[PDB]
Amino acid sequence: VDGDQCESNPCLNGGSCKDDINSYECWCPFGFEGKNCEL
Numbered sequence: 001v002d003g004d005q006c007e008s009n010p011c012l013n014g015g016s017c018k019d020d021i022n023s024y025e026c027w028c029p030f031g032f033e034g035k036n037c038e039l
Contacts, residue, residue, distance in 0.1 A: 010024075013037045014029065015027055
């Protein structure tokens with residue numbers, strides 16, 4: 001489980017962590033952006 005980028009919900013504000021291939025993608029609610037939804 002090396003593609004366990006959704007271990008401790010890295011994304012912020014109250015977003016979800018989705019996986020792609022090797023790395024992850026965060027899914028933020030409508031109005032938030034960033035790598036780990038920081039804005």
